[PDB]
Design a protein around this motif. Sequence first.
Motif, PDB file in Angstrom:
ATOM      1  N   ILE A  72       0.853  -1.179   0.000  1.00 56.82           N
ATOM      2  CA  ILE A  72       0.000   0.000   0.000  1.00 56.82           C
ATOM      3  C   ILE A  72       0.891   1.232   0.000  1.00 56.82           C
ATOM      4  CG2 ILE A  72      -1.783  -1.285   1.226  1.00 56.82           C
ATOM      5  CD1 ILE A  72      -1.086   0.336   3.725  1.00 56.82           C
ATOM      6  N   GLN A  87       2.378   7.140   9.067  1.00 61.70           N
ATOM      7  CA  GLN A  87       3.080   5.874   9.245  1.00 61.70           C
ATOM      8  C   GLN A  87       4.443   5.894   8.564  1.00 61.70           C
ATOM      9  OE1 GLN A  87       0.486   3.650   5.678  1.00 61.70           O
ATOM     10  NE2 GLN A  87       0.451   2.897   7.791  1.00 61.70           N
ATOM     11  N   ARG A 126       6.531   7.465  11.041  1.00 61.66           N
ATOM     12  CA  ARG A 126       6.684   6.572  12.182  1.00 61.66           C
ATOM     13  C   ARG A 126       7.740   5.509  11.910  1.00 61.66           C
ATOM     14  NH1 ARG A 126       3.300   2.486  11.704  1.00 61.66           N
ATOM     15  NH2 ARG A 126       1.335   3.659  11.697  1.00 61.66           N
ATOM     16  N   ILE A 127       7.741   4.940  10.706  1.00 67.28           N
ATOM     17  CA  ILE A 127       8.728   3.911  10.401  1.00 67.28           C
ATOM     18  C   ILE A 127      10.081   4.540  10.085  1.00 67.28           C
ATOM     19  CG2 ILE A 127       8.545   3.541   7.912  1.00 67.28           C
ATOM     20  CD1 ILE A 127       8.654   0.992  10.804  1.00 67.28           C
ATOM     21  N   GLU A 156      11.387   4.876  13.334  1.00 60.68           N
ATOM     22  CA  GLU A 156      11.574   3.572  13.960  1.00 60.68           C
ATOM     23  C   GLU A 156      12.916   2.953  13.594  1.00 60.68           C
ATOM     24  OE1 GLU A 156      11.374   0.127  12.766  1.00 60.68           O
ATOM     25  OE2 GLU A 156      11.616  -0.559  14.835  1.00 60.68           O
ATOM     26  N   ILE A 172       2.150  -8.122  -1.171  1.00 56.13           N
ATOM     27  CA  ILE A 172       0.911  -8.139  -0.405  1.00 56.13           C
ATOM     28  C   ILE A 172       1.287  -7.750   1.017  1.00 56.13           C
ATOM     29  CG2 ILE A 172      -0.829  -9.564   0.699  1.00 56.13           C
ATOM     30  CD1 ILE A 172       0.226  -9.671  -3.058  1.00 56.13           C
ATOM     31  N   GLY A 173       0.842  -6.573   1.454  1.00 62.91           N
ATOM     32  CA  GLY A 173       0.786  -6.195   2.856  1.00 62.91           C
ATOM     33  C   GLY A 173       2.006  -6.456   3.713  1.00 62.91           C
ATOM     34  N   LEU A 219       6.594  -5.520   4.438  1.00 64.53           N
ATOM     35  CA  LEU A 219       7.707  -4.584   4.432  1.00 64.53           C
ATOM     36  C   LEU A 219       8.925  -5.250   3.813  1.00 64.53           C
ATOM     37  CD1 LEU A 219       7.512  -2.991   7.980  1.00 64.53           C
ATOM     38  CD2 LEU A 219       7.097  -1.831   5.809  1.00 64.53           C
ATOM     39  N   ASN A 277       9.617  -9.222   5.470  1.00 60.49           N
ATOM     40  CA  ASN A 277       8.459  -9.869   6.065  1.00 60.49           C
ATOM     41  C   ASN A 277       7.225  -9.739   5.190  1.00 60.49           C
ATOM     42  OD1 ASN A 277       7.747  -7.205   6.414  1.00 60.49           O
ATOM     43  ND2 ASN A 277       7.458  -7.325   8.631  1.00 60.49           N
TER      44      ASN A 277
END
Lengths: 147, 50, 49
Positions: free
Chosen positions: A88, A94, A97-98, A101, A120-121, A123, A134
């Motif tokens: 996405i 976010q 945020r990452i 992170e 698909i969804g 990182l 992942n």
Amino acid sequence: RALAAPLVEALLTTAAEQIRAAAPRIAGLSASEAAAVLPADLLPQVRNFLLTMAKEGLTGELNAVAAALPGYLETGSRAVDASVTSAIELSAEQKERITRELQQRYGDVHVTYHVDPTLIGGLIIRVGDQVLDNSLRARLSAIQRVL
Amino acid sequence: AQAEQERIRMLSEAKSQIADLVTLTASRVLGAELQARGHDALIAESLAAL
Amino acid sequence: AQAEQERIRMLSEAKSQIADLVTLTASRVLGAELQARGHDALIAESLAA
């Protein structure tokens, strides 16, 4: 020592300012074309370097050279260019945020967020030459191994 | 014997095709689920090892 | 003929396709959470044959 350090830093800042200001001055323009475009907004060594760069017309990434000017003050090595890919499109909250992170290495390292919606969804975070995956496409292949 | 070997090969190929079709269906279902829920929930997994 | 019969049997979702897809979504695609926030229609409609 101390005098050299301030001198080096001041010279680096001046070079960065000149490159940022006059990068687009001789950008693309050929040796004859950018010769007039070459302004007084550079030191004689800086003006000579800009003339050499724009003699072929490759004066587009001079801002990167500007970005190369400040890091050379502190011996660089802070690039830590990392690349994050998620299925996405990343929302700004976010994304920040990452970015925050991944502070384990140098903090908000140079991150060029990508999408590649074939994933698909998940990182895909590549820091330097170590990649962490992942993504559920990876799990997809790791289950599809049953074939 | 050759017919039996061909039958075994056909069974293996059918199993492989079934596995590939199942993988494609699972990928489509996962894509639909990600489109509905949103991939943002996976962002928390970025701290598992990094 | 045997392969065609096996393909016809596997074409039904509740026999092979739906159960395998649900198991993959639960155990593999997620952390034992097949529901996520939907996918109720994708369980059946996307299965097709």
